[PDB]
Amino acid sequence: FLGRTGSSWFKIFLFYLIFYGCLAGIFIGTIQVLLLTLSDFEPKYQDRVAPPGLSHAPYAIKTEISFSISNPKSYESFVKSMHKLMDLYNESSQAGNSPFEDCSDTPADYIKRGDLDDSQGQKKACRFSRMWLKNCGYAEGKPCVVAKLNRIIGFYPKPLKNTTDLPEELQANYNQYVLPLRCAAREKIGSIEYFGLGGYAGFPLQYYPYYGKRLQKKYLQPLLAIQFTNLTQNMELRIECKVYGENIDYSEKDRFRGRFEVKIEVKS
Amino acid sequence: LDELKKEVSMDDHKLSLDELHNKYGTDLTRGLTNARAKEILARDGPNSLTPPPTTPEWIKFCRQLFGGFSILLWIGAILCFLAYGIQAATEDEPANDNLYLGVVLSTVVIVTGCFSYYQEAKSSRIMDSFKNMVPQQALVIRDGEKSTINAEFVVAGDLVEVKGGDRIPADLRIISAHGCKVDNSSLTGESEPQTRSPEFSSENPLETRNIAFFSTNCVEGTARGVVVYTGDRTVMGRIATLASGLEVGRTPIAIEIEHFIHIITGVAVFLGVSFFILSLILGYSWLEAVIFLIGIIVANVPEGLLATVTVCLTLTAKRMARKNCLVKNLEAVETLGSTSTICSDKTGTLTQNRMTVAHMWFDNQIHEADTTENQSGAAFDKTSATWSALSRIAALCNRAVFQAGQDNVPILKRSVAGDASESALLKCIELCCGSVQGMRDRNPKIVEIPFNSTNKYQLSIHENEKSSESRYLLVMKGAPERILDRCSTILLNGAEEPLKEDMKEAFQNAYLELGGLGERVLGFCHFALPEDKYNEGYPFDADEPNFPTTDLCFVGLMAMIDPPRAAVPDAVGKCRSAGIKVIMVTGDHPITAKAIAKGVGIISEGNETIEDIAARLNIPIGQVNPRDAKACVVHGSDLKDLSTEVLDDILHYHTEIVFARTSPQQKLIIVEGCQRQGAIVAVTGDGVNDSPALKKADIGVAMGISGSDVSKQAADMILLDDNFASIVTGVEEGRLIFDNLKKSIAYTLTSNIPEITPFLVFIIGNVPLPLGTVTILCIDLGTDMVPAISLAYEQAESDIMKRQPRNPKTDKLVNERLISMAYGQIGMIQALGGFFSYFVILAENGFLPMDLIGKRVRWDDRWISDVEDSFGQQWTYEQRKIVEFTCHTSFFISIVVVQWADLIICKTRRNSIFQQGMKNKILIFGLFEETALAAFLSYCPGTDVALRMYPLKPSWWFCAFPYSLIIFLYDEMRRFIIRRSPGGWVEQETYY
Amino acid sequence: EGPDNDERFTYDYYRLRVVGLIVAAVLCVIGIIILLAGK
Numbered sequence A: 001f002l003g004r005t006g007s008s009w010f011k012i013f014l015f016y017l018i019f020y021g022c023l024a025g026i027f028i029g030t031i032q033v034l035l036l037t038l039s040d041f042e043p044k045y046q047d048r049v050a051p052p053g054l055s056h057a058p059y060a061i062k063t064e065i066s067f068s069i070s071n072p073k074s075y076e077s078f079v080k081s082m083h084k085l086m087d088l089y090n091e092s093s094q095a096g097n098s099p100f101e102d103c104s105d106t107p108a109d110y111i112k113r114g115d116l117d118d119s120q121g122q123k124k125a126c127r128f129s130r131m132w133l134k135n136c137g138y139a140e141g142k143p144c145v146v147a148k149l150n151r152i153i154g155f156y157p158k159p160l161k162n163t164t165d166l167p168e169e170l171q172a173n174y175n176q177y178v179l180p181l182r183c184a185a186r187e188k189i190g191s192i193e194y195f196g197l198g199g200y201a202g203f204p205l206q207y208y209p210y211y212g213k214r215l216q217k218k219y220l221q222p223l224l225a226i227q228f229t230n231l232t233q234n235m236e237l238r239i240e241c242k243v244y245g246e247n248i249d250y251s252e253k254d255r256f257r258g259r260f261e262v263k264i265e266v267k268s
Numbered sequence B: 001l002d003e004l005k006k007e008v009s010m011d012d013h014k015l016s017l018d019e020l021h022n023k024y025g026t027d028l029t030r031g032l033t034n035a036r037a038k039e040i041l042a043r044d045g046p047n048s049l050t051p052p053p054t055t056p057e058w059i060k061f062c063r064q065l066f067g068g069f070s071i072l073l074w075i076g077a078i079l080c081f082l083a084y085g086i087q088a089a090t091e092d093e094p095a096n097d098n099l100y101l102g103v104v105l106s107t108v109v110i111v112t113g114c115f116s117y118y119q120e121a122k123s124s125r126i127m128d129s130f131k132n133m134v135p136q137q138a139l140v141i142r143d144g145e146k147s148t149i150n151a152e153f154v155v156a157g158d159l160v161e162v163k164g165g166d167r168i169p170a171d172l173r174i175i176s177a178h179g180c181k182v183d184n185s186s187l188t189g190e191s192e193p194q195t196r197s198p199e200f201s202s203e204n205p206l207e208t209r210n211i212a213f214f215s216t217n218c219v220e221g222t223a224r225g226v227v228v229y230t231g232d233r234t235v236m237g238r239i240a241t242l243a244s245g246l247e248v249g250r251t252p253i254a255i256e257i258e259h260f261i262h263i264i265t266g267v268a269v270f271l272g273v274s275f276f277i278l279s280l281i282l283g284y285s286w287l288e289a290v291i292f293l294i295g296i297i298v299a300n301v302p303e304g305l306l307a308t309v310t311v312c313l314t315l316t317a318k319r320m321a322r323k324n325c326l327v328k329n330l331e332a333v334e335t336l337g338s339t340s341t342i343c344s345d346k347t348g349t350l351t352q353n354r355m356t357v358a359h360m361w362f363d364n365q366i367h368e369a370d371t372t373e374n375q376s377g378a379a380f381d382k383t384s385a386t387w388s389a390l391s392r393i394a395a396l397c398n399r400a401v402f403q404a405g406q407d408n409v410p411i412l413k414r415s416v417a418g419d420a421s422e423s424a425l426l427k428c429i430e431l432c433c434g435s436v437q438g439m440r441d442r443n444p445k446i447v448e449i450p451f452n453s454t455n456k457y458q459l460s461i462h463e464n465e466k467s468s469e470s471r472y473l474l475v476m477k478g479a480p481e482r483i484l485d486r487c488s489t490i491l492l493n494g495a496e497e498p499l500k501e502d503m504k505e506a507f508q509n510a511y512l513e514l515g516g517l518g519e520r521v522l523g524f525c526h527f528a529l530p531e532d533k534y535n536e537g538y539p540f541d542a543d544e545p546n547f548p549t550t551d552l553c554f555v556g557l558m559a560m561i562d563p564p565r566a567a568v569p570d571a572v573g574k575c576r577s578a579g580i581k582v583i584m585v586t587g588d589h590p591i592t593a594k595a596i597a598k599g600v601g602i603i604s605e606g607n608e609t610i611e612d613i614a615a616r617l618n619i620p621i622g623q624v625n626p627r628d629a630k631a632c633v634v635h636g637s638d639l640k641d642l643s644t645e646v647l648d649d650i651l652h653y654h655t656e657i658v659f660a661r662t663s664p665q666q667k668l669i670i671v672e673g674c675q676r677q678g679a680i681v682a683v684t685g686d687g688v689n690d691s692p693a694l695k696k697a698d699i700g701v702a703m704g705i706s707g708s709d710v711s712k713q714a715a716d717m718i719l720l721d722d723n724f725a726s727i728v729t730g731v732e733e734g735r736l737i738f739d740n741l742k743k744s745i746a747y748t749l750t751s752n753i754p755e756i757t758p759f760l761v762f763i764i765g766n767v768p769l770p771l772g773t774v775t776i777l778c779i780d781l782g783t784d785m786v787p788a789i790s791l792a793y794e795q796a797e798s799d800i801m802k803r804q805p806r807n808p809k810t811d812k813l814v815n816e817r818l819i820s821m822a823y824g825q826i827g828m829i830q831a832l833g834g835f836f837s838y839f840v841i842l843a844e845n846g847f848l849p850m851d852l853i854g855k856r857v858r859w860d861d862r863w864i865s866d867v868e869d870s871f872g873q874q875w876t877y878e879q880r881k882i883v884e885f886t887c888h889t890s891f892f893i894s895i896v897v898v899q900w901a902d903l904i905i906c907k908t909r910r911n912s913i914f915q916q917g918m919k920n921k922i923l924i925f926g927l928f929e930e931t932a933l934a935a936f937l938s939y940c941p942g943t944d945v946a947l948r949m950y951p952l953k954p955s956w957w958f959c960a961f962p963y964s965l966i967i968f969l970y971d972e973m974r975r976f977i978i979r980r981s982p983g984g985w986v987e988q989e990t991y992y
Numbered sequence C: 001e002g003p004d005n006d007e008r009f010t011y012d013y014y015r016l017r018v019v020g021l022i023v024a025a026v027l028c029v030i031g032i033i034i035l036l037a038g039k
């Protein structure tokens, strides 16, 4: 033929069949032992998610949400993702004492449901009403963005203490139980309005620590609705929403490390 | 074009002096007119040689920039700029990826260009050396007056004059001469002075006395002649053009390189476009379809391989430089290993090029002297009183002297003023009797008759050094038979005795044997003149026989020859044991050529020519079956009337071939004949008459000390110490480097698979990219470099000089067996070890292997800063990318770790590491430096930006260890099978 | 620890780099030693 005879062509096939078969069987074996060394409830390493990311619902083309108020299908793209998220926070999804629980309607302290063990059933998560998100189809004019803190197993988000000076200096400082979120731009051509649990501009600490998908399915993380009823129009406004805390940090590279990058433009 | 120049020349030495003048419109006495000479100048053109048109270095450099790998790397470099252009227009990408990768790849092509350019070097100044043989000026007779003119202004027809010490300015017809002798070594390779006279003495113009040639010099006397040829039209000017004009051609090693380039280029374009369409079918945007292709290019092309080859060659050439063997062309480092036939000059190559005493006949006994340079033999006789009598004649009846200031150099190597035979005798006595000058001071010469054409003897009368005598001793030497007709007694073991027919017959026997050995034989005799008949003041007349020259006492015979170099016989046998055929090709006479052939082992004992059979059986040569003769001796005059097909039959039908009295073109023809049969041929030589053959040879080797400038220009290799044993070393080195290149190539190729497979699974699996493009270049250009080179220092696995020369048609540098092992077996194991570490990194950070399938879409999505892992955690864009790049880093390090084992297994093709050992210090160096480089690239701060290399956790380093070990075991088991059964299965499938 | 389990999300990449570079250097020196056993 090309290389060899039929007899040789066969033998080279019988070899590579057994050979690659063995190699596949060995590869799988090493994957088995790897998995055997891992927990079902907690990942081996967590230093790469460490400082929590802050992500929002409006799917930004490039950290930007520009549209026209005087146009219907101009914002119907951002309403798709906005709906996708809030559709999960339905009351019909949170039914019965299992696996949900009614928690303080005001920001409270942490809740420990034991260890990362299966020695108990599904760890009961705090309910969250999308109805706590006042004012927010969504904002056809002047968007109503929804913030979110990335989930990390066993992470206890710790707010800053009012020992020294603060950006939003001491205003509504629920020091003990709220992780604040203050959006900014100089360039003050807007109108910041925050909505959340208990009416505070933060995340209620009663939703922590997260026990993971395996030990807490259907779990709901707290949301923080933000509305920009800015009196300006037809210009790119670089708005940055920042979260503050002891366990919260940022990076010049990762522009989502505990903060937002939104470029709103109501070009109408 | 040069087929005309490969033919024997035609001449006009047969014409009379007068007749020759009519042909050139010339005067025998007055010479040409100033006007007629200038007319002929413009007519024929200058008496000069024009160098052939060369290829500029520009075109030579750029021709390498387009050879398979460079072509693919160019397509990659441009395709980078393509994707970059498409980006800069569509979505403003502030990145530098495609732009920089395009710059990097273009640089890789340029630098790789320098390496191949360095390897494909051609240092040739043939025509320049020939031009150096034309004198600046010549002496001509014009308008009846002699004047010096620019030799280029010399034309056919003018009257030229030459004298001892000057170069022949052009081909001349001798019309007048006085004691003129010439050095025709340019045409023959033999430096013994040849007389020139107006008389025609041979039909063959290269042998007649009435022609003098350009490229030769007058050694003594004076001559006048008419110019018959000028410039390019001279006999050796044509040889110049032939030699300078000959197409170089591709070396065996070069052909091998191009061959695997085709193979690897083939699989590259195959998988390249095979997966380019496979991606579009899967619905991949052309934006991405090209990005994958660039990666495929980089994965398939072994970027550092061609440069490795060059370095391995260079390092092998450095070792040979250290044995006095200079390599002018890097590729010639290997040709000697692939050589199946050596065509060797005799004089100054196989031989020392110096008349040396070989045997002596005295006391009715043949004695042998030591002919070797360094005198590696033993003594023959010292005791016999006869010896001292013969020794005295050899010293006394001798007019040769050592040049001043030689006392530093060895006797046999020092320059001597005199003819070759007298120098030989001088050096013979000086060696075994001490200072000859002393013997010539103790015995003052009073009268002598120098060797005469008519007398055929030379005699001398000396004052006997003996005090009790202080009388007159007569000594003489000459033609053995002439000396015999002048002897009455023979000095036997001390005492004289009558010359009976018995001893006279033993003389003839001794004389015939020595002459049969191709040796020049001389007779020696002396006579103690009677005291009473010769007073202390008796005057001797040299002009008229004033003393007896008959009834003298015969002392002995001495024989001499230009002997082989000490190492030559043994080197010839070694070449022949390695299955190399050795042919002699010489301008010298057949009797001498044949005798040295037997001396060095070109013709082995018992082997006969058709002429030998005929003489032994006493039958006509036509009655001899030529197939009964394995040896042959072909004279150039017969070679001339043979067609190439008939020359091919001679080459095919004889194992032991001697081509004697060959012209320079004839040497070229014999070389071409050998090549025509498909053989790789080496030429060894030292003369300008070797230049065409040396050029045409696959490899020409010139002698460094004895070699002429031309020969060393025509060669690929120079033996700087004239050590013929270096050929044996050269062939051995050549074979070793050929095997080691295979090892180094397999090693380099093996790591291509773990660079290809990640890109494929990236498409078919939709997982995050396991390894990057930049990461690949860190391997092929970084870590693999020193290890790959180090394989050039591997010792032989067996006695390589015991095997036959490779068949260049069947035995390739890269074959299917190499690809099967490198691509199908070892590289495949390396790929898995890479993937394993990849799955380990991701799974330990929260992305278990199961959830990875079909995630790249969301993984690469720059706007999704919340991808969910297996544990329910959310990752930003840059966070998961850090893990991904950490995966690139550990995959990279996995390659290094699996290349550890590969380096050790590529060490040997057959033998076990437990047999060959670990005595390669460069290889071990490679292991340490490779690992140092990898660690540095991972842990050095800032490398995460320039190369996207991230720090690895200690446990990460050990992921591929079990795969590295399986490689070592697998290959060790496999080679154990090879050795345990030379049959073929494992052998014919995987044995590189 | 409980709410004070910050060490769980921390890794000393600084020490690892220091050690990694020490090792790389020493492997580089060791290599020179073995190579220079004859040049």
Ligand SMILES: *[C@@H]1O[C@H](CO)[C@@H](O[C@@H]2O[C@H](CO)[C@@H](O)[C@H](O)[C@H]2NC(C)=O)[C@H](O)[C@H]1NC(C)=O
Binding pocket: A086, A087, A088, A090, A092
């Ligand atoms: C989650 O809540 C949303 C609230 O808008 C539900 O949307 C309803 O969709 C139905 C049918 O398309 C409409 O008739 C209603 O007007 C919507 N709102 C309400 C309050 O009922 C959505 O269907 C819910 N999703 C799930 C899975 O239950």
Ligand SMILES: CC(C)CCC[C@@H](C)[C@H]1CC[C@H]2[C@@H]3CC=C4C[C@@H](O)CC[C@]4(C)[C@H]3CC[C@]12C
Binding pocket: A003, A012, A016, B757, B760, B816, B817, B819, B820, B823, B824
């Ligand atoms: C990534 C995976 C799926 C690709 C696997 C490719 C396999 C099938 C390839 C890789 C190397 C290949 C072999 C390389 C060498 C030879 C020897 C030659 O004389 C005949 C073909 C043969 C035997 C090839 C057959 C196919 C082969 C085994």
Ligand SMILES: *[C@@H]1O[C@H](CO)[C@@H](O)[C@H](O)[C@H]1NC(C)=O
Binding pocket: A134, A135, A229
């Ligand atoms: C939000 O909606 C409420 C009614 O639910 C209305 O009273 C109020 O004006 C709205 N706020 C703004 C800022 O438009």
Ligand SMILES: [K+]
Binding pocket: B694, B695, B696, B697, B698, B699, B700, B714, B715, B716
């Ligand atoms: K050559």
Ligand SMILES: [Mg+2]
Binding pocket: B189, B345, B346, B347, B348, B349, B685, B686, B687
């Ligand atoms: Mg010679």
Ligand SMILES: [Tl+]
Binding pocket: B298, B299, B300, B301, B302, B303, B752, B755, B776, B780
């Ligand atoms: Tl490569």
Ligand SMILES: [Tl+]
Binding pocket: B302, B748, B749, B750, B751, B752, B780, B784
């Ligand atoms: Tl490679």
